[PDB]
Design a protein around this ligand. Structure first.
Ligand code: CLA
Ligand code: CLA
Ligand code: CLA
Ligand code: CLA
Ligand code: CLA
Ligand code: CLA
Ligand code: LHG
Ligand code: UIX
Ligand code: KC2
Ligand code: DD6
Ligand code: DD6
Lengths: 184, 177, 69, 120, 99, 194
């Protein structure tokens, strides 16, 4: 089960002994029909960093899940503004260059993201453990069962990885084709 | 029950330094500055900033609305008032007075840290409109802190927006695109 | 002014009489002597007259021995 | 500490120092921290404490290899035996000619008799 | 020492044997003597901890006053004030026109 | 124990027992560093010289001795006055200073051995009028100290007002006065930079 972060932080820090499980028993290594322990390069053999690896994986998955939808939506709809109009910016891939620099539109996003990351670094480093890796307490809609929680974590990880690859595919295809959503 | 979590950031444990101090209801310190610096110094600086920023906000609002003291040298806008009065000579004298008051504040801080006097971080002995009951005193200290924080943010916004848009204090009739 | 400086200094040295005080100045006493050095002419003449300025040469090292002992 | 790096560190360190290594050595750091951490002891460490421990413990590539230790030992043995692996100074350095000469002459304590190709 | 009051400070021999939490709910900390005058003791954490570790130095007004009482600071301040006075006299009354 | 005048600072402990210390006010610890007897003697001396100085500063602008060319700006009266008479004033001041303290004039000599039992500011001048009752005597001492301190501040203000106005004291704002901005004109670091 998942315990409140206050209780979970009681046993937190860089563990030195190793639970003898694949990746310390973390969720996300499960095939469709059986068990799929994917680690060809043996990165999980650094058991002390395994919690950091899971935190980074979940951060990347969530960020790419947002990024893919943010590459899809703008072409269909835009913010009601003159500088966000299709005439000022034809495709999402143009947004970075359009809003970089003195305009500050992307500078504000960078600033707020940096503030959020500065505030979350304490959990990322100090209070990171096998059970609280990627857990910020936003557990609304989280099932109240062990199997349900495990399945939800697996679904998050799988969708995050799918979007992690899909964002690379979509951004590369969009840069290559200069085309609307279908090629991204 | 485990650690005591910060109400501001529920996924972080409250810093023990900011317990029992006014403003602990929020318990906001995700970056852990209270774990590295003395909370007495932190609160003294916070209160100094809040008070100075409240005065600065009210002064900027007043000058932007108008209300200039009688005299020709003061017929300048708030943005250039700093340089105009530095040339005039008001600002050097004001800074001398600030140095005097801050010498006394520095003596207060030093004595507080050395324990010679049981002085609270921002306390200077002023008791005006101060409730007698302890709960009232706590509430008034929290009110001071929150008004000061709001004034810090408000002055930052006011000065930045004024310098950017070249408009008066409300900035409502400003063009942004 | 120069007599003021010299008097002050000599007075600090006489009052302290310690290498530790010479190294770590007793700033209160030093300031007191600096302030007091204003009457140095009268004070110095009085000490010279009364014998509190110079000590007999037999009380201080004369130098190297020039003869057999 | 990794098993391979531990083996390399033990090999590099003199055997007599394993019992109680000097204060300023990687083996001393390892002893001090293994006496406090491990099975039957503190099984967790703060992130910063672990970071500093990994900073101040040695990596594998920092310690000498078997071949390097053998080469150094052979060099020292040659010099102590009185033989010199011949070298000639070059530009801001010296080249090794691959030759071992007899540096000490017939009279071992005589500085006049040290052998050189130029005179001997 | 007031800083570490309420902290469970276990010696290296008791590491792992004592698991009682601190007043702040932190795990016990291992204390070691280093034989360094600058840092006589060093503490390691047994786990994630939420504790105050001041990075600011402990400076006393008495210590600062002693440092300034050191003959160097006394005489340097005296000489700086004297030089400033002479420079300001030169500024205010240039060329010694009075003489 | 917080000081009455500065309730956020520790109370000074070495200045007790002197009149005028009701609001114990020694934030910089001068009474701690030096002898309060000498400090109080100096304070009294400054007060007396300064109150006489304020009265003379006011009077000289209007009335002068027969001859004795006037100087509306009383700051220039020192230059305008007869040098021999000014030297006579200095001579009388020196005679009084030496005689009152018998020769123990310095920070160390005065209040040392004999003469330590003497009160800080007491020069045995006009003591016939001192009220017998200690309450009235202390009230009179406090009144003297208050008038002296006010006189010190007033003389400083008089001198600096004369400096800024570059003119006589009594007209506070001369004709066409616009402000003291242009008085401190010598180049400064920040001023020259900006
Ligand atoms: C990785 C995440 C990410 C990033 C870096 C950006 C970056 C950007 N988006 Mg956004 N966007 C995102 C996710 C992201 N988006 C998502 C998930 C959506 C779906 C709601 C959108 C929908 C969206 C629209 C409709 C538009 C942008 C636009 C922009 C640009 C201007 C900022 C703005 O108006 O944001 C607005 C962002 C939101 C309203 C939703 C943010 C949701 C989460 C918090 C992210 C900028 C390049 C503008 C553009 O195309 O300019 C050319 C624009 O008109 N975005
Ligand atoms: C952080 C606080 C702060 C600072 C640094 C300044 C700085 C300045 N103010 Mg002031 N001012 C302040 C607060 C402050 N003000 C407040 C709270 C008010 C509202 C009463 C005013 C009202 C005010 C006016 C009406 C004017 C200034 C002006 C000025 C300039 C010359 C000083 C002067 O005449 O003050 C005057 C101060 C007062 C009349 C009362 C101050 C009351 C509290 C104690 C402050 C200078 C840039 C003058 C200027 O150059 O304007 C362009 C000017 O005309 N200020
Ligand atoms: C501090 C200054 C200094 C500098 C600038 C150099 C520079 C050099 N040394 Mg070094 N050397 C130094 C001090 C210095 N040495 C000292 C103090 C010693 C005595 C222990 C040596 C002993 C030494 C040796 C034993 C050798 C060098 C060699 C070299 C060369 C190495 C690069 C090379 O061959 O590139 C070209 C390759 C591509 C280069 C000319 C090598 C060389 O060839 O020297 C002639 C070499 O084998 N040096
Ligand atoms: C410490 C106080 C003080 C000092 C330093 C001086 C100094 C001076 N006064 Mg004096 N004066 C003083 C108190 C003082 N006064 C008081 C209390 C009064 C009021 C009775 C006067 C009334 C007075 C008059 C009426 C005159 C002087 C004048 C002078 C000047 C020359 C004559 C003199 O000194 O006698 C000299 C600069 C003379 C002057 O005008 O010199 C230019 C002059 O005529 N003073
Ligand atoms: C400004 C002029 C002036 C005047 C009129 C006097 C007058 C006096 N001083 Mg002097 N005195 C002066 C300046 C003056 N002093 C200064 C500038 C200083 C500081 C260097 C002193 C320091 C001083 C001391 C330390 C002593 C006197 C003493 C004396 C007496 C003179 C004895 C004498 O000359 O015997 C004939 C030769 C007399 C009260 C003595 C005194 O009052 O003893 C009771 C005494 O001990 N004075
Ligand atoms: C006893 C010596 C003496 C005296 C009588 C004066 C007198 C004066 N100085 Mg100062 N000055 C002094 C030493 C002295 N200074 C020294 C040692 C320095 C080197 C830092 C300076 C550097 C200096 C500057 C650069 C300026 C003055 C100025 C002035 C005037 C205003 C007061 C002030 O700012 O003081 C300052 C006194 C200090 C000791 C400076 C403090 C240095 C650090 C921060 C320690 C505190 C006044 C004429 C200002 C003025 O009015 O110019 C028009 C001015 O611009 N002074
Ligand atoms: C405590 C010790 C005891 C202090 C006693 C009283 C000291 C008075 C000092 C008077 C100096 C007076 C003085 O220095 O001003 C004098 C000078 C004025 O120059 P102006 O350009 O106005 O020249 C025109 C002439 O009319 C000036 O006479 O300004 C400066 O050089 C100031 C530069 C620093 C200004 C700093 C701005 C403040 C920013 C806010 C944050 C500050 C943090 C505090 C720093 C630690
Ligand atoms: C036998 C024997 O021994 O004789 C006896 C005789 C007797 C009489 C009994 C004795 C006495 C006592 C005496 C002589 C006492 C004299 C007391 C005086 C002269 C007090 C002056 C105060 C001036 C003040 C406060 C000025 C304040 C000035 C201020 C506030 C000025 C303020 C402004 O100038 C400023 C600063 C700028 C201007 O532009 C504006 C204004 C407002 C004018 C003795 C000691 O027992 C000796
Ligand atoms: C070692 C050889 C090997 C190769 C060369 C290889 C190549 C590719 C390629 C490119 C050519 C793609 C595009 C691809 C894609 C997926 N592989 Mg796959 N794969 C290999 C091995 C396994 C194993 C052991 C498992 C597995 C799985 C999945 C899932 C299912 C995700 C899910 O729904 O959980 C997806 C999408 C797991 C599973 O359950 O598949 C039904 C699973 O256990 N794969 N795989
Ligand atoms: C547009 C633009 C910008 C940009 C950009 C950005 C954000 C770019 C992002 C790029 C990104 C995010 C690129 C991902 C690539 C992923 C790859 C290559 C994955 C390969 C994967 C391979 C080869 C194989 C995977 C697997 O074998 C594994 C390991 C195990 C198997 O079981 C399953 C399979 C076979 C699948 C700027 C700089 C911001 C502004 C500028 O103006 C222009
Ligand atoms: C930034 C911005 C905006 C804004 C804004 C905001 C939120 C602004 C907020 C401003 C704010 C919050 C300003 C508080 C001032 C408080 C003061 C001066 C208190 C003085 C209090 C004093 C002088 C008290 C003194 C005493 O307590 C002492 C010391 C001791 C006792 O004797 C008792 C007394 C009473 C005597 C707009 C307008 C919304 C839009 C625009 O586009 C951009």
């Amino acid at each position: 089960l998942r315990r409140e972060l206050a209780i979970a932080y009681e046993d937190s820090g860089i563990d030195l002994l190793d639970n003898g499980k694949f990746c310390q028993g973390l969720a996300g290594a499960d095939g469709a029909w059986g068990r799929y322990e994917f680690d060809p390069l043996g990165f999980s053999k650094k058991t002390e960093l395994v919690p950091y690896f899971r935190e980074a994986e979940l951060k990347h998955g969530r960020l790419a899940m947002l990024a893919w939808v943010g590459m899809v939506v703008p072409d269909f709809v835009r913010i009601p503004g003159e500088k966000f109009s299709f005439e000022a910016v034809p495709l999402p891939i143009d947004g970075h260059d359009a809003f970089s620099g003195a305009t500050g539109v992307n500078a504000q996003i960078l600033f707020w993201v940096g503030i959020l990351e500065f505030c979350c670094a304490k959990k990322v480093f100090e209070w990171n453990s096998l059970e609280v890796a990627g857990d910020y307490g936003l557990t609304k809609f989280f099932p109240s069962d062990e199997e349900g929680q495990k399945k939800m974590r697996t679904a998050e990880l799988k969708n995050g990885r799918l979007a992690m690859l899909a964002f690379g595919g979509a951004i590369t295809q969009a840069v290559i084709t200069r085309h609307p959503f279908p090629w991204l | 029950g485990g650690y005591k979590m910060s109400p501001a950031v529920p996924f972080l444990p409250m810093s023990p330094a900011l317990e029992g101090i006014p403003g602990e209801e929020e318990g906001f310190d995700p970056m852990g500055f209270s774990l590295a610096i003395d909370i007495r110094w932190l609160r003294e600086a916070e209160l100094k900033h809040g008070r100075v920023a409240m005065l600065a906000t009210v002064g900027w609002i007043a000058t932007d609305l108008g209300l200039r003291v009688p005299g020709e040298p003061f017929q300048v806008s708030t943005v250039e008032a700093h340089d105009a009065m530095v040339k005039f000579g008001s600002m050097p004298q004001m800074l001398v007075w600030m140095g005097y008051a801050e010498l006394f504040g520095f003596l207060a801080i030093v004595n507080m840290f050395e324990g010679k006097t049981d002085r609270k971080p921002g306390d200077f002995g002023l008791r005006g409109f101060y409730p007698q009951d302890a709960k009232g005193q706590y509430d008034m200290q929290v009110k001071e802190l929150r008004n000061g924080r709001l004034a810090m943010l408000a002055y930052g916004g006011i000065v930045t927006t004024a310098v950017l848009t070249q408009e008066k204090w409300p900035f409502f009739d400003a063009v942004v695109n | 002014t120069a007599g003021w400086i010299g008097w002050a200094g000599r007075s600090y040295l006489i009052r302290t009489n310690d290498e530790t005080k010479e190294l770590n100045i007793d700033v209160p006493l030093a300031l007191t002597c600096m302030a007091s050095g204003f009457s140095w002419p009268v004070a110095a003449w009085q000490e010279i007259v009364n014998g509190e300025m110079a000590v007999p040469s037999s009380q201080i090292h004369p130098g190297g021995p020039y003869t057999q002992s | 500490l990794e098993a391979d790096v531990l083996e390399k560190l033990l090999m590099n360190t003199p055997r007599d120092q394993w019992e109680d290594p000097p204060e300023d050595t990687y083996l001393y750091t390892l002893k001090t921290f293994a006496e406090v951490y491990g099975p039957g002891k503190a099984t967790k460490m703060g992130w910063w404490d672990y970071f500093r421990l990994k900073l101040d413990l040695p990596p594998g590539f920092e310690l000498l290899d078997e071949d390097e230790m053998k080469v150094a030992a052979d060099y020292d043995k040659l010099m102590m035996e009185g033989k010199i692996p011949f070298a000639v100074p070059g530009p801001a350095g010296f080249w090794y000619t691959g030759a071992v000469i007899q540096w000490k002459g017939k009279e071992q304590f005589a500085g006049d008799q040290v052998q050189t190709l130029t005179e001997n | 020492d007031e800083r570490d009051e309420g902290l469970v400070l276990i010696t290296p021999e008791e590491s792992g044997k004592v698991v009682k939490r601190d007043v702040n709910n932190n795990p016990p900390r291992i204390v070691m003597k280093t034989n360094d005058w600058d840092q006589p003791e060093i503490q390691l954490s047994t786990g994630a901890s939420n504790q105050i570790n001041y990075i600011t130095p402990v400076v006393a007004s008495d210590d600062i006053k002693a440092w300034l009482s050191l003959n160097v600071n006394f005489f340097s301040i005296l000489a700086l004030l004297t030089v400033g006075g002479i420079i300001e006299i030169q500024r205010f009354f240039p060329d010694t026109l009075y003489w | 124990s917080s000081s009455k005048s500065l309730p956020f600072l520790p109370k000074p402990q070495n200045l007790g027992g002197l009149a005028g210390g009701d609001a114990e006010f020694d934030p910089l610890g001068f009474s701690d560093t030096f002898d309060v007897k000498w400090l109080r003697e100096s304070e009294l001396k400054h007060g007396r010289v300064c109150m006489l100085a304020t009265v003379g500063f006011v009077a000289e602008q209007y009335i002068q001795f027969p001859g004795f060319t006037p100087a509306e700006d009383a700051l220039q009266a020192i230059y305008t006055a007869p040098p021999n008479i000014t030297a006579l004033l200095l001579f009388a001041c020196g005679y009084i200073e030496s005689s009152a303290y018998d020769g123990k004039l310095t920070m160390l000599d005065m209040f040392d051995g004999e003469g330590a039992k003497r009160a800080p500011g007491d020069l045995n001048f006009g003591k016939r009028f001192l009220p017998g009752d200690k309450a009235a005597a202390d009230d009179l001492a406090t009144k003297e100290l208050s008038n002296g301190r006010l006189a010190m501040l007033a003389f400083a203000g008089m001198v600096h007002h004369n400096l800024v106005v570059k003119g006589p004291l009594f007209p506070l704002f001369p004709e066409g006065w616009a402000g003291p901005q242009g008085s401190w004109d010598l180049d400064s670091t920040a001023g020259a930079l900006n």
